[model samples]
Target chain A: VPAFLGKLWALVGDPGTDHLIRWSPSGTSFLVSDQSRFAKEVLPQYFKHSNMASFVRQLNMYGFRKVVSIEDHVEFQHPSFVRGREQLLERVRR
Target chain B: VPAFLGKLWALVGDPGTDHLIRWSPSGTSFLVSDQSRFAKEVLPQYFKHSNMASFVRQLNMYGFRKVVSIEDHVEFQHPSFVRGREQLLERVRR
Candidate 1:
């Protein structure tokens, strides 16, 4: 995983567990944030039950240009999924 | 009603009927658009049942700056929601 991914994962949590993290087609971009906590909390389960990976993939691809421009996109998909602000600062210092 | 209000009511439908049309404090601003048709269609019922008029009014005020800048804002609240673009153009021409 890239260094930035580590920082991102900490802020957004694991996309695998947090359904809010979604990637676009071509796997180049995603939308992740707590825009509406109640609505988003059930998204993962909904996707799983509906078998919507392909549909989601298509949407991601179609909206890739717009989603990529978002400043929080990269950080939202980080793999570390763990780290406090101080820890992040320490990592940057190193 | 102002002349612009007539145009806006036409585009936005009656704010009294469409829950998506909301006004700001001082009654100087509003947000009106269909970003997601499905999500928005239910907004009216939700607002009515929840007695959310005051809450909506507050948000409209707080977000007035961002919402008023939208080009579609005025047209979306038109009272004459019956007019087609051709009719609007004809009105403007006259």
Candidate 2:
């Protein structure tokens, strides 16, 4: 058997603009990773189990358009806004 | 209609050791991105059309075990071994 732990967060992306945050209510998906610079995970499997409580700040599937002389529907993926970097001592560890 | 460009790599992963490589026979799943650090790509839609000619150095799905105090089957996924990071001048571009 196992227990679940919720993860709370504050996201301040952009230079001066305050962005939003995502909170996956599943708490179970909350993983602490050396890989994550800012948002130390709470990703993949655990969050999938988090019962949709896991929320993301502003990660999106949106796109945009641009035109200088003609026209353009420039494509883009709304990407995760930040990474919460801490410190890691590899020590040849995983 | 599209064409597939193969990615050949020399994955010297370990500081002094040499690793292997992977070649997707279908060469279809390859995806290149500004996101991709190295292997500037020849990926995704193009490779699927490449008639399986594309190859990779050594990306795998294997794992191993380890123990210092007791018996252990340390879990891991054979992972892609590199990022081909060069340069990026976002310059408000995608």
Candidate 3:
């Protein structure tokens, strides 16, 4: 994951977000977020307004601007997944 | 880096490409590329006659579209960068 790859530089929240992945001036990092969900989670806690309506139906909003889909990814299990058990055994025996 | 991560799936080039990253039913791999560039390179070769006029100012295609920004990624140095030189030496000595 980019989070563990020593690759994440800064993650920006939009006052509480478009949702596009924009690159930095250096192109090594990016800005990405979920807009309304982020607001639903933070703004309520931050403003102490627990009754803030969160559902789209609650706001009469529908048909959506963009339907985003996320992809799955392989993960690093570190040394355990790096090599075989035989290699670990040999090291232990030595 | 995604290519080297053993992560790339089918790279779809348009017959020539609204280029957005879409996830599959499996949600693992993605389709991404330079749409106009892909057509310029392959279509010209596939169609013969190489002067396809691959410039934007050559046409009326201004005001731009979605500007895509790619993030830099770390690469696996494999068995070398994985462990220290001393660890490698221990393996060899054993």
User: TM-score for each prediction?
Assistant: 0.18, 0.14, 0.18
lDDT of each: 0.32, 0.19, 0.25
Candidate 3 C-alpha lDDT tens digits along A11-85: 221322223323322121233344445345533543433332442222223211121212111111112111223
lDDT of 2 by residue, A1-94 (tens): 0122112222222222121223112110112212232233223333433222232221221111111111001111111111231111111111
lDDT of 2 by residue, B2-40 (tens): 011112222222221111223221111122212232223
- Among all windows of ten consecutive residues in candidate 1 chain A, which has the lowest summed lDDT? A70-79
Best by DockQ: 3
Query: Clash number for model 1?
Result: 16
Q: Which tens-of-lDDT digit does each residue in A23-79 have in candidate 1?
A: 322122234444344134534344433333443343343221121110112211111
Task: Pick the winner on TM-score between candidates 2 and 3.
Answer: 3
Q: What is the lDDT of residue A55 in candidate 3?
A: 24
Q: Which runs of model 3 end up more than 4 angstroms from their true locations? A: A1-34, A42-94, B1-37, B45-67, B70-94
Error of 2 at B9 (Å): 12
iRMS, all models: 17.4, 22.5, 17.3
Candidate 3, residue A43: how far the Cα is off, in Å: 9.3
Judge candidate 2 at residue B67 and give its lDDT.
11
* lDDT of residue A76 for candidate 3: 14
Docking class of 2: incorrect
